[PDB]
Structure formats: C-alpha cells, structure tokens
Symmetry: C4
Subunit: 220 residues, 4 copies
C-alpha cells in the first residue's frame, strides 16, 4: 500500500469535495418540488454539475466524479490501480454523505433521485445504462486524449453535455444512473438496493468498452 505523494491525497480529496457538491446539487434539483415534465430540469442540473465541477477541479484530480469514468481511465492506463481505488472510495463516501443531507431535507417515496426502473426489464436496463455510459466515457477519454490539438472548446462543457445527453436518453427508462457512486448514495440512505446491480454492471462495462473501442480499435 503506502500511497503517500501529497498531491495524490489532494486528488482524492478533490474527488471527495466535488462528489459531495455534485450529489447535493443534483439531488436537490431532482427533489426540488409530475415527473415527465420535470425531466428537462433534472437533465440540465445533472449536466451543469459536471460542466462546473470539472472546470473547477479537473486540473487537480481529473474531475472523474464517476466510478465508470474512473474505470475507463484505469482501463486506458492513465491512472494507477491504487489511485483508481482511492478515487472510487472518495466518490462513494462523498455521494453517501451528500445523499444523507439531501434526503434529510426531504414526496413520500416518489424520490426521482433514486435509480429505479420504469418500463424496462433489468436485462434491458443494463443495455440502456451501458450505452448511456459508453457515450459518456468515450467522450471523456476522447476529449482528454493528450494526442489531440483540435479540442479548442470547453472540454468540461462537452463532458457535462454528454452527461445531460445520457439523462435525456435514459431518465425515462432507468432514471439514468451512468454513475455507480451516484446510484449507491440514495440506495444506501434509503436502504433500498432493489435492482441496484443494473446500475453497476451497466455503467462499468459501458466505460470499459468505451476505453477498449477507443484505444485498441478506433484511435490506436
């Protein structure tokens, strides 16, 4: 073990603080006040949280704030195993901590901030979460490709808009998890892990393939 490296602890700490802010703001927007109409607001808040916290903390920790993105970075050999494990631990702790506050301020059980299923089987929910996270991790890896000089725009904005796209595509079927750490928090605070594995198998593989297709196939 023996991590050390003072800047590495700040990377893990930036992931923790950013995950707390990310989950607090996104769940506070979801639980704000039917749901089909509210979907647009929820998508915008979840995208802008990434588009802001990445622009604020990417130079300090890469601003993953997503275990699927962290696994996509680990599959691309851009971080170490120890750094990825500590990243996921910090993201899960920040997500549970912020989830406790947002579910403390709280419509009975409506709670749109809990990844459930709405019209799809778990076998289909895994595919929906997998493609909705594949596009996200592919965007994160391609936009952070150090071999490119054409990215003259806001990369955190591109990643946040990718999250918002995954929401626009997956919030009506599975609530759009695309973030195992964001699906654990509410499931831990409410103590409801029904169909929770769908929001872990789906995103993670979607991230891993996003690395493998990008590196070992698309852009060698």
């Amino acid at each position: 073990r023996e991590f050390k490296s003072k800047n590495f602890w700040k990377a893990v700490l930036a992931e923790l603080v950013g995950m707390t802010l990310f989950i607090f703001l996104s769940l506070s927007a979801a639980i704000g006040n039917t749901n089909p109409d509210q979907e647009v607001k929820v998508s915008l808040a979840f995208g802008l949280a990434i588009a802001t916290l990445a622009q604020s903390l990417g130079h300090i920790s890469g601003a993953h704030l997503n275990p699927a993105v962290t696994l996509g970075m680990l599959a691309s050999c851009q971080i170490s195993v120890l750094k990825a494990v500590m990243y996921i631990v910090a993201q899960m702790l920040g997500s549970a901590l912020a989830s406790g506050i947002v579910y403390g301020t709280r419509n009975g059980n409506a709670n749109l901030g809990l990844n459930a299923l709405s019209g799809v089987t778990p076998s289909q929910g895994v595919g929906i979460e997998l493609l909705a996270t594949f596009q996200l991790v592919l965007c994160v890896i391609a936009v952070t490709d150090k071999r490119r000089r054409d990215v003259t725009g806001s990369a955190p904005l591109a990643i946040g808009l990718s999250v918002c796209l995954g929401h626009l595509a997956a919030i009506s079927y599975t609530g759009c998890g695309i973030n195992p750490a964001r699906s654990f928090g509410p499931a831990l605070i409410l103590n409801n892990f029904e169909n929770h594995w769908v929001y872990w198998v789906g995103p993670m593989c979607g991230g891993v393939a996003a690395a493998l297709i990008y590196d070992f196939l698309l852009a060698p």
Copy 2:
C-alpha cells in the same frame, strides 16, 4: 481507396457513432411517448443535438463525425472527401441507424405514432421538402463554414456549434415534419418499423440542402 487504415477507421467511427447517435436520440423519442407539447419538442431537440455535440467531440478526429448522409454529401460537394469515402460513410450511417433503431424498438413497443419517425404534421409534401431543405441547409452550411481550414476566428467548440445547429433545426422543423435533416436518422426507424411513407421527402430535402449549402458557401459566399 479500400485499405489504408485512416479510411477504414473513419468508416468504423462513422458506424459506431451513428449507432450511439440514433440509440440516444430514439431513446428520447420514446420514453414518455405520449403528448407533443413544447416540452417534449425542446427535449427531443436537445437530445438530438447533444448526441452530435458529444459524438463529434468523441470521433471527429477519426472521421470528421458526419453521421449524416446530407453532411457527407455536402462535404463531397466541397471536395473535402472522395466519392468512395462518401459511399462508405453513407453505408455506415444507414447501417448504424438501422441497428440502433432495432435496439430502441426492442426496448420500446410497436409505436402508434412513436414520434421517432419523421412524418408530416400540418404541411404538404411540397412544403415539407422546403422545410427539411432549409433545416438541413443551415446545418451543412454551418458544418462547412466552421470546418473551413482557412479560418482562425473559430475559437469555440465546433462540435458544440454543430450540435446546437441540429438542435435549432429540430426547434424549427420538429412541429411540421419532425425534423429529419439526416437521411440515415429517418431511414433507421423507417426500416425497422417498415414504414416508408413520405420517406423521399427526407432524402430530397436534406441531400439538396447540403449540396446547396456547399455550393453557396464555396462557389459564392467564401470562394476558393
């Protein structure tokens, strides 16, 4: 030609990107299916635009991220690609669109009106061709002007500009024709659902709009 990896990886990027683009856009098309109220209008516009704004930022360095036979034809008219590259691009776009449509219609049901099929809502085909043509003209004109390698004033996110152009074409054409501006996007669901009613409108419109945007930008607006 038919070997150099830079061409085949471009075709493969077109296939993967078109599959992701159509899957993500069609997943927004169904979902809450019912009601065509302005909030659904805006949401569908946003999803269809952000799919480009993400997949272009992810695959443009590999294939230009056309994901649109009208954009591919506009690039062919601008002499930026070859005919063989355009043919393989259009085939890849149609295949990716049909495949993603098959998956989305596997998760969704039959689809009475579905809305994920570009149809007509209050306009004749003579008017629908004009609406689709101008809505694709602005898109291909934007793509060619923003990717003009003779410009140094483009200091913003070009995939974001193209995605916002798609979103604008939706905001302007989704209530009349559903906004196709992509023959492959209008082909996928029409192939899986086996419904090609007024399908020629969404090929004549986009293709001619892209070729005209190319000629007006190059042969008129920005010469050479």
Copy 3:
C-alpha cells in the same frame, strides 16, 4: 454612391442569405404548434439561430443580422455608412422574404412571431426593448473588440446566448423584438404596424448607447 468592391457585395449578400435563414427558422419555431409554456422553445430557437449563422457567416460579413447591431457597429466606426445602409436593406429584404414563406405555411391571429404588447404601455415597452437590446449590442461590441485577447470561447455562442437572454427577459412584455428588421417582416406581411415604432426606437437607441457607453466611457 458607386459602392463596388466585390467583397462588399458578398458582405451584403451574406447578410441577405443569413437573414432569410434566421427569420425562416425562428418564425417556424415560434408558429410550430398556450404561449407562456412555449416561451422557452422560442427563446432557444432565436438564440441558436444567431449562434449558428454567426459561426457560419461572421468571417464573411460580421453576421450582424440585426439593424440595431449594425447601428451599434456604425456608431463604433467599425463599418462605413454605405455598408451599414446596404446591410440594413439586405436584412429588411431577407426578413420580409422569409416572413412571407413562414406566414404562407401558417392559429388564426395568435401568431407569436409578431411583436405585440402584453401588459405594458408603449412608454414601458420602449424601455424594455431598449435594455434588452442594449445588453445584446454591448455584448456584440465587447466580444468583437479587436483590442482583447481573453476571448477564448465561442463568440457567436455568446452573442446567441445574449439574444436568448433578451428573449427570456422581454418575450412576456413585448414579445422581444431587439431586431428592427425582425419586427418589420411579419408587420409587413400581415400588414399590421400597430405600435411598430416601439420596436424601432427601443432597439436602435439601445444599440447606440451600447456603443457610446462601451467606447466613450467604459473602454476608451
């Protein structure tokens, strides 16, 4: 007179083609299908039309597409009087031409694409249009200030978002004109010039002050 200069005719022509596309797409979005809910859609379409046509034609004509912006540029001495007059003529012709098509494809008289008044006197409507165009022309002039090197973002996107902001602020009071050429088209095709001067005095002065406050006061 004798304009000449081949590139100047292309500047006027780019203004004409861009104005036709701008008015067609924006009015087609407004007349698409109550109104308070539709406001968001109308604002987005009107902002994205600028954010796209500027990114497509600014290197060819500056992409004014707005007589208030053209007057703000003329007050800043960035264009000539002949070029500004020809610009306004091209914008008015393109607006009337596109307005004829959009009002040809057309709810009785609802027509949100016609600048009317909804809860404000003309004396107040002039102030609303003036500030809503002041912010726009100020943004256009400041973002196109050739003495700045900090503008590392999409300037057409900033201008389009300024238009969208003017819509979010003025569409419920006056319908948000902030464009004398965009207020003339529908008023000419429908032959209804009631309170039309409000949508000319308001924006123009709002643009002129935007120049004077920026140059002769804020940034000399």
Copy 4:
C-alpha cells in the same frame, strides 16, 4: 485607491453590469408571474445564468464582472483584489441591483409572491443557510478556479462556465429558497419592495460560501 481610472472604470462597469443583470433577471421573474412549475423553474434559471454569461463576456475585461458581493468577497479572500476595490464593488452591486429592481417593479405590479424575491419554500432557515451556502460555494469555487492565472487548460468560454454555474445554482436552490447566491440580487427587490424577511440568510449563506470556496481552493485544493 480613489483615482486611477482602471479602478473607477471597474466600479462603473460593476454598476452598469449589475443594473443590466438585475433588470434582465427580474424581467424573467415577473412576466407570466403565476405558477411555479418546472418550466418556470428552468426559465428563471436560464435567464439568471445567461445574464451573467452575457454581461461577463461584455465587461469582464473591465472589472472581472463580479456582479456578486459573494464573488467579490471570494476574490478578496483569494487576495486578487484590495479591500477598497471590494467595498466599492459591493456598493456598486447593491446600487445597480436596487436601481434595476426599481425599474422592473415599475413595469410590474406590487407582487403578491412575485418570485423575484428570494424567500423560503419548504425549508427552515437553518436548512436555507446550508442550501444557499453550498449553492454559492460551487459558484465562487468555479469563478476562482476558472480564473486561476496558473492554468492553461481553460480553453473554453469562462463567462459561459460562470453563467452555467449560476444556472446550476438556480436549478438546485430555486425550489427551496429561490436561489439567491448573490446578496445584491436578493437586496434589490427586498429594498424596492421593502420586505427583508429572512434576508440575513441570503447574506450569511453566499458570503460564507464564497469565503469558504476561496479558502478551500487556495489554502487546500490548489496551493499558492
């Protein structure tokens, strides 16, 4: 100090920009006044964010475009401005907010609930302070991190990032507290309407959130 034009033009830019910011945001607050449905929620978020995303792009080269006493205090905690500049900034922001509020409430009526006044909707003041504090913490942290002159990875539109941060703070706090994250924005209407109920929440929240964001970014996250 109290002479050099670069300081006074900055204060004047703060005044003009705050007047435009509050006028444009409050014009969105009234308008259709009634109903607090998610579409009004999103629309108010967009107007309040785009006002920053435009006025910052217009006046940041002249004054940094704080337009927020919490952002000004966060910059003072980051030692990027002096105390005199911060005092003149806060005075200019309060004056511009009150003036624009007077104009907007001249075009609008009395305002039963108005919504253009940051109040409480389902949370205690102890919870409202936390919501306003985190919603301003993210904003000031973003402003300081994106304007860190030691970074070269900020290749996007910084005023757009700050405006989207304001829009996010609205999407997260407008249903609980109306989203203040700007003491001057919460002061203007409260001064013109003469209603300072729970006004201290929208000063303790934003100010402390900005100072904490400055200390956490500088003294912890990004040293030196």
